[PDB]
Amino acid sequence: XXXXXXXXXXXXXXXXXXXXXXXXXXXXXXXXKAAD
Amino acid sequence: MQRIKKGDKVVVITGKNKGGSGIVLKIMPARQQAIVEGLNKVTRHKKKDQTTKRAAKQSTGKVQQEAPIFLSKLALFDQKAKQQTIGKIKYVMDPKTNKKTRVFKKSNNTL
Amino acid sequence: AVQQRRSSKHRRDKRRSHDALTAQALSVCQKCGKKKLFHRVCSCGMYGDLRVKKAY
Amino acid sequence: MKRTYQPSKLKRAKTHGFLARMATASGRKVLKLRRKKQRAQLTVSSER
Amino acid sequence: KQTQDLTKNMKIKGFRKGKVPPTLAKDYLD
Amino acid sequence: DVTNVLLKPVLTEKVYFNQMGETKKYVFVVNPKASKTRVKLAFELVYGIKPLKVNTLIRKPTTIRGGSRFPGLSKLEKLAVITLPKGIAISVTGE
Amino acid sequence: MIAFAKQFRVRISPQKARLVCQLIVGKKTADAQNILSNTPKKAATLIAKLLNSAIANATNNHGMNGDALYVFECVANQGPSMKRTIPRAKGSSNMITKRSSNLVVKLSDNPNERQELIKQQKALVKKRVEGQQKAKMARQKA
RNA sequence: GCGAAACAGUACCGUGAGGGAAAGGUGAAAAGAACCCAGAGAUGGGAGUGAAAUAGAUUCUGAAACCAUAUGCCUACAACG
RNA sequence: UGAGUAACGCUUGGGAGUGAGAAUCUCCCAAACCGAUUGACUAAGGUUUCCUGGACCAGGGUCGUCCUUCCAGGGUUAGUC
Ligand SMILES: [Mg+2]
Ligand SMILES: [Mg+2]
Ligand SMILES: [Mg+2]
Ligand SMILES: [Mg+2]
Ligand SMILES: [Mg+2]
Ligand SMILES: [Mg+2]
Ligand SMILES: [Mg+2]
Ligand SMILES: [Mg+2]
Ligand SMILES: [Mg+2]
Ligand SMILES: [Mg+2]
Ligand SMILES: [Mg+2]
Ligand SMILES: [Mg+2]
Ligand SMILES: [Mg+2]
Ligand SMILES: [Mg+2]
Ligand SMILES: [Mg+2]
Ligand SMILES: [Mg+2]
Ligand SMILES: [Mg+2]
Ligand SMILES: [Mg+2]
Ligand SMILES: [Mg+2]
Ligand SMILES: [Mg+2]
Ligand SMILES: [Mg+2]
Ligand SMILES: [Mg+2]
Ligand SMILES: [Mg+2]
Ligand SMILES: [Mg+2]
Ligand SMILES: [Mg+2]
Ligand SMILES: [Zn+2]
């Protein structure tokens, strides 16, 4: 046996959750489609 | 001073257990509860844990202990009176010892 | 190219109508009885009457 | 390619350090606002 | 014998298994 | 002098490897503000045998228990490696 | 009389699990185990474990015969998802949705179980209507 | 409602000034599920405590969109806001 | 919804073993590329990412018994650098 956890903090399913900063610094440029 | 101390006989006036006489073994003033022997018997499902010299055995089955009870539900039990009854207490100060002593208000019994 | 109109929950299931699965053909081993998919060696390594591999 | 930030232990401390901010009147004003905002990282000195 | 039985696993704080001290195994885990 | 620069002895595989074979090497943890000369003086006034030489280690603080709800840093240690002369071996416990 | 087993936050997606789940509905116990043990799919070694546990707690907990159990309904409900950021090109970013499924398998001994479910539904609808009638009698009484 | 009811000017972004979140509720009392079965285990099904376990730590109530199952009816010559 | 679609970002075969489960983990034999370099020593930077044992919540564009991930312990010795 000898399966126990006497420590004040002990866990196998560590709590964590990934977050997203929504980094979408997208841009664009010019074109050859200019009808002037 | 305090209404309930460690040692004096006390009973319960409300709940499933009515007229439950017991001795207060310990008082937690901050959360306002009181451990009284023989009352509020709960049975933790004792698991098995082995990580220490004493935990190598830690024989624990259906150990029945004591659950704390709010002090409001407790009431002092009279002993000096021939006909024991449940009442409220005062805080008279006798000049004989200049020490505060609890006295009931439906009788003249000290403590 | 991208859909100019969203596809409903009905056209989606109509397309998935052909995504159903087929049950692989199984047979019984002639020395131990467990079901094994046809034309293949069983778990004991015994195919027909020839001992192919050592038992699991 | 060579990106904008090329780390250097000296340049960082000598440009945005506590003593650099404490050498001009403007630096004292910026530090006062950051103390007002109660920033845990008051300057780049307290990296750890 | 007895000291052999008490040297298996039971890792000490600052130590590992296997190289358990031949003479010092009765202080921490007493 | 005040003897607050001798905090705690430490026993590891490295310590026990050195602590055998004629000259013994005892590794303690000392005040991070203390100097080698202070370490030798503290050892002189509380044990009685002059160290042959002293070596010092600085272990930098690092993040510990990472990912746990509240992460924490380590503690700054200064380690001192005293080596007593040939044939002398004093006990760290028992005076 | 339904015996059942459940599994929360199964890594397989509900879309890829329902495809295998339709291969087991209505099948007998022994035949159901044989089909799932030789199908080359990822969501085959997890429903098999769930199915075996359901059989075990049907013939041990609920006290069932064991030679009449058939898979009543085996479905993969949608479980909680997990959101991650996949780094795309030119500085953009997209969101990967890791999908999870809540698997539940249920087997019965009676081949007429749909009828009993309709009976409880009928009883509930029926239970609603007399109260309306009882309220009407009381209303006329006053 | 102060940006901040939780350890918030924190996590995080930026060389820097600066910018700046989300997240509360088991039960009267943990009495937080001993024990049995399947499983490698988490876990699930029973048992037990509890008034309530479809109050079980995913923890007050649990709406719609959305995804599946089923009683009954209709649908494979058919131009459909 | 698009849709289980595009994509999964330069490197093979086998034997034995562990394990509940192995194209992906360990060992061995080959095989294929680097060889003014994918070799070795360090500056800058990074800040424990280094070693041992254990685990497979999460991360690894698959899998995983394995990891630069997580847990526990340990590791950096100067009169001449
Ligand atoms: Mg549908
Ligand atoms: Mg299709
Ligand atoms: Mg030095
Ligand atoms: Mg980029
Ligand atoms: Mg920063
Ligand atoms: Mg339950
Ligand atoms: Mg929910
Ligand atoms: Mg709820
Ligand atoms: Mg027709
Ligand atoms: Mg026609
Ligand atoms: Mg027409
Ligand atoms: Mg969208
Ligand atoms: Mg889809
Ligand atoms: Mg297409
Ligand atoms: Mg295609
Ligand atoms: Mg492709
Ligand atoms: Mg690749
Ligand atoms: Mg390849
Ligand atoms: Mg070559
Ligand atoms: Mg190189
Ligand atoms: Mg790290
Ligand atoms: Mg390593
Ligand atoms: Mg390892
Ligand atoms: Mg994976
Ligand atoms: Mg020398
Ligand atoms: Zn066979």
PDB file of C-alpha atoms in Angstrom, chain G residues 4-128:
ATOM      1  CA  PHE G   4     -25.763   2.460 -17.611  1.00  0.00           C
ATOM      2  CA  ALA G   5     -22.194   3.744 -17.477  1.00  0.00           C
ATOM      3  CA  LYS G   6     -20.765   7.201 -18.117  1.00  0.00           C
ATOM      4  CA  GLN G   7     -17.437   8.872 -18.903  1.00  0.00           C
ATOM      5  CA  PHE G   8     -16.890  12.625 -18.707  1.00  0.00           C
ATOM      6  CA  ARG G   9     -14.418  14.619 -20.824  1.00  0.00           C
ATOM      7  CA  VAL G  10     -13.460  11.826 -23.205  1.00  0.00           C
ATOM      8  CA  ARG G  11     -10.732  13.088 -25.529  1.00  0.00           C
ATOM      9  CA  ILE G  12     -12.479  11.805 -28.671  1.00  0.00           C
ATOM     10  CA  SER G  13     -14.684  14.291 -30.504  1.00  0.00           C
ATOM     11  CA  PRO G  14     -18.456  13.675 -30.528  1.00  0.00           C
ATOM     12  CA  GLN G  15     -18.423  13.771 -34.335  1.00  0.00           C
ATOM     13  CA  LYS G  16     -15.888  10.941 -34.553  1.00  0.00           C
ATOM     14  CA  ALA G  17     -17.503   8.984 -31.701  1.00  0.00           C
ATOM     15  CA  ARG G  18     -21.112   8.933 -32.920  1.00  0.00           C
ATOM     16  CA  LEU G  19     -19.842   7.212 -36.084  1.00  0.00           C
ATOM     17  CA  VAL G  20     -18.677   4.238 -33.996  1.00  0.00           C
ATOM     18  CA  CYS G  21     -21.621   4.449 -31.585  1.00  0.00           C
ATOM     19  CA  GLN G  22     -24.082   3.691 -34.408  1.00  0.00           C
ATOM     20  CA  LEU G  23     -22.258   0.373 -34.922  1.00  0.00           C
ATOM     21  CA  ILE G  24     -23.297  -0.904 -31.493  1.00  0.00           C
ATOM     22  CA  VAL G  25     -26.942   0.172 -31.012  1.00  0.00           C
ATOM     23  CA  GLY G  26     -29.343  -2.771 -30.864  1.00  0.00           C
ATOM     24  CA  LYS G  27     -26.657  -5.467 -30.727  1.00  0.00           C
ATOM     25  CA  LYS G  28     -26.479  -8.416 -28.347  1.00  0.00           C
ATOM     26  CA  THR G  29     -23.892  -8.487 -25.566  1.00  0.00           C
ATOM     27  CA  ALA G  30     -21.419 -11.014 -26.997  1.00  0.00           C
ATOM     28  CA  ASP G  31     -21.811  -9.763 -30.570  1.00  0.00           C
ATOM     29  CA  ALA G  32     -21.361  -6.169 -29.404  1.00  0.00           C
ATOM     30  CA  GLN G  33     -18.037  -6.963 -27.721  1.00  0.00           C
ATOM     31  CA  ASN G  34     -16.728  -8.875 -30.756  1.00  0.00           C
ATOM     32  CA  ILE G  35     -17.434  -6.075 -33.255  1.00  0.00           C
ATOM     33  CA  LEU G  36     -15.753  -3.382 -31.146  1.00  0.00           C
ATOM     34  CA  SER G  37     -12.634  -5.444 -30.386  1.00  0.00           C
ATOM     35  CA  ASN G  38     -11.559  -5.688 -34.052  1.00  0.00           C
ATOM     36  CA  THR G  39     -12.424  -2.256 -35.482  1.00  0.00           C
ATOM     37  CA  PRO G  40      -9.367  -0.107 -36.324  1.00  0.00           C
ATOM     38  CA  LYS G  41     -10.586   3.157 -34.778  1.00  0.00           C
ATOM     39  CA  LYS G  42      -9.367   5.230 -31.846  1.00  0.00           C
ATOM     40  CA  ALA G  43     -12.879   5.520 -30.390  1.00  0.00           C
ATOM     41  CA  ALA G  44     -13.100   1.731 -30.092  1.00  0.00           C
ATOM     42  CA  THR G  45     -10.817   1.037 -27.131  1.00  0.00           C
ATOM     43  CA  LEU G  46     -12.699   3.586 -24.999  1.00  0.00           C
ATOM     44  CA  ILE G  47     -16.306   2.545 -25.650  1.00  0.00           C
ATOM     45  CA  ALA G  48     -15.136  -1.030 -25.067  1.00  0.00           C
ATOM     46  CA  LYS G  49     -13.925  -0.131 -21.579  1.00  0.00           C
ATOM     47  CA  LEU G  50     -17.173   1.735 -20.885  1.00  0.00           C
ATOM     48  CA  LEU G  51     -19.234  -1.154 -22.269  1.00  0.00           C
ATOM     49  CA  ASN G  52     -17.435  -3.728 -20.114  1.00  0.00           C
ATOM     50  CA  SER G  53     -17.950  -1.641 -16.973  1.00  0.00           C
ATOM     51  CA  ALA G  54     -21.644  -1.257 -17.824  1.00  0.00           C
ATOM     52  CA  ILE G  55     -22.052  -5.025 -18.216  1.00  0.00           C
ATOM     53  CA  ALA G  56     -20.226  -5.566 -14.917  1.00  0.00           C
ATOM     54  CA  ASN G  57     -22.442  -3.193 -12.930  1.00  0.00           C
ATOM     55  CA  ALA G  58     -25.552  -4.624 -14.611  1.00  0.00           C
ATOM     56  CA  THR G  59     -24.937  -8.250 -13.563  1.00  0.00           C
ATOM     57  CA  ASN G  60     -23.419  -7.334 -10.165  1.00  0.00           C
ATOM     58  CA  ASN G  61     -25.133  -4.175  -8.896  1.00  0.00           C
ATOM     59  CA  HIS G  62     -28.603  -4.417 -10.439  1.00  0.00           C
ATOM     60  CA  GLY G  63     -28.677  -8.227 -10.508  1.00  0.00           C
ATOM     61  CA  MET G  64     -29.345  -9.015 -14.153  1.00  0.00           C
ATOM     62  CA  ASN G  65     -29.254 -12.356 -15.948  1.00  0.00           C
ATOM     63  CA  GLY G  66     -26.423 -11.463 -18.338  1.00  0.00           C
ATOM     64  CA  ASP G  67     -27.514 -13.399 -21.449  1.00  0.00           C
ATOM     65  CA  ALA G  68     -30.325 -10.995 -22.426  1.00  0.00           C
ATOM     66  CA  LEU G  69     -28.595  -7.593 -22.269  1.00  0.00           C
ATOM     67  CA  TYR G  70     -28.622  -5.539 -25.473  1.00  0.00           C
ATOM     68  CA  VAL G  71     -27.236  -2.051 -26.081  1.00  0.00           C
ATOM     69  CA  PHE G  72     -30.274   0.197 -25.634  1.00  0.00           C
ATOM     70  CA  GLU G  73     -28.642   3.515 -26.554  1.00  0.00           C
ATOM     71  CA  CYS G  74     -24.952   4.379 -26.870  1.00  0.00           C
ATOM     72  CA  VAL G  75     -24.333   8.077 -27.610  1.00  0.00           C
ATOM     73  CA  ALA G  76     -21.541  10.657 -27.328  1.00  0.00           C
ATOM     74  CA  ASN G  77     -22.839  13.981 -26.055  1.00  0.00           C
ATOM     75  CA  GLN G  78     -20.791  17.141 -26.511  1.00  0.00           C
ATOM     76  CA  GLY G  79     -18.436  17.809 -23.627  1.00  0.00           C
ATOM     77  CA  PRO G  80     -16.653  20.986 -22.552  1.00  0.00           C
ATOM     78  CA  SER G  81     -14.144  22.319 -25.058  1.00  0.00           C
ATOM     79  CA  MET G  82     -10.702  23.850 -24.592  1.00  0.00           C
ATOM     80  CA  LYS G  83      -9.579  26.984 -26.423  1.00  0.00           C
ATOM     81  CA  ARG G  84      -6.010  27.425 -27.731  1.00  0.00           C
ATOM     82  CA  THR G  85      -4.275  29.942 -30.016  1.00  0.00           C
ATOM     83  CA  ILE G  86      -2.532  28.483 -33.085  1.00  0.00           C
ATOM     84  CA  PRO G  87       0.031  30.976 -34.473  1.00  0.00           C
ATOM     85  CA  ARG G  88      -0.657  31.651 -38.155  1.00  0.00           C
ATOM     86  CA  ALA G  89       1.302  33.562 -40.803  1.00  0.00           C
ATOM     87  CA  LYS G  90       1.840  37.318 -41.199  1.00  0.00           C
ATOM     88  CA  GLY G  91       1.165  37.961 -37.514  1.00  0.00           C
ATOM     89  CA  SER G  92      -2.405  36.650 -37.463  1.00  0.00           C
ATOM     90  CA  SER G  93      -3.818  33.998 -35.142  1.00  0.00           C
ATOM     91  CA  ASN G  94      -6.639  31.453 -35.084  1.00  0.00           C
ATOM     92  CA  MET G  95      -8.417  29.488 -32.376  1.00  0.00           C
ATOM     93  CA  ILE G  96      -8.070  25.697 -32.078  1.00  0.00           C
ATOM     94  CA  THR G  97     -11.040  24.115 -30.303  1.00  0.00           C
ATOM     95  CA  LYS G  98     -10.044  20.860 -28.624  1.00  0.00           C
ATOM     96  CA  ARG G  99     -13.319  18.935 -28.531  1.00  0.00           C
ATOM     97  CA  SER G 100     -14.395  16.525 -25.798  1.00  0.00           C
ATOM     98  CA  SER G 101     -17.300  14.082 -25.639  1.00  0.00           C
ATOM     99  CA  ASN G 102     -19.411  12.836 -22.728  1.00  0.00           C
ATOM    100  CA  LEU G 103     -19.887   9.126 -23.443  1.00  0.00           C
ATOM    101  CA  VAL G 104     -22.771   7.156 -21.942  1.00  0.00           C
ATOM    102  CA  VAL G 105     -23.789   3.567 -22.720  1.00  0.00           C
ATOM    103  CA  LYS G 106     -27.039   1.978 -21.527  1.00  0.00           C
ATOM    104  CA  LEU G 107     -28.234  -1.628 -21.858  1.00  0.00           C
ATOM    105  CA  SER G 108     -31.594  -3.227 -21.016  1.00  0.00           C
ATOM    106  CA  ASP G 109     -33.065  -6.734 -20.659  1.00  0.00           C
ATOM    107  CA  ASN G 110     -36.601  -6.009 -21.838  1.00  0.00           C
ATOM    108  CA  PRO G 111     -37.016  -5.680 -25.632  1.00  0.00           C
ATOM    109  CA  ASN G 112     -40.009  -3.336 -25.191  1.00  0.00           C
ATOM    110  CA  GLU G 113     -38.330  -0.540 -23.220  1.00  0.00           C
ATOM    111  CA  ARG G 114     -39.412   2.321 -25.482  1.00  0.00           C
ATOM    112  CA  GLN G 115     -42.999   1.651 -24.414  1.00  0.00           C
ATOM    113  CA  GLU G 116     -42.244   2.156 -20.699  1.00  0.00           C
ATOM    114  CA  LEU G 117     -40.555   5.502 -21.384  1.00  0.00           C
ATOM    115  CA  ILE G 118     -43.646   6.659 -23.266  1.00  0.00           C
ATOM    116  CA  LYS G 119     -45.750   5.431 -20.328  1.00  0.00           C
ATOM    117  CA  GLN G 120     -43.937   7.680 -17.844  1.00  0.00           C
ATOM    118  CA  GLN G 121     -44.248  10.555 -20.316  1.00  0.00           C
ATOM    119  CA  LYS G 122     -47.951   9.790 -20.678  1.00  0.00           C
ATOM    120  CA  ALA G 123     -48.268   9.638 -16.901  1.00  0.00           C
ATOM    121  CA  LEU G 124     -46.620  13.052 -16.515  1.00  0.00           C
ATOM    122  CA  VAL G 125     -48.849  14.609 -19.173  1.00  0.00           C
ATOM    123  CA  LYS G 126     -51.783  12.796 -17.625  1.00  0.00           C
ATOM    124  CA  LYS G 127     -50.724  13.944 -14.157  1.00  0.00           C
ATOM    125  CA  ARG G 128     -50.846  17.559 -15.345  1.00  0.00           C
TER     126      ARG G 128
END
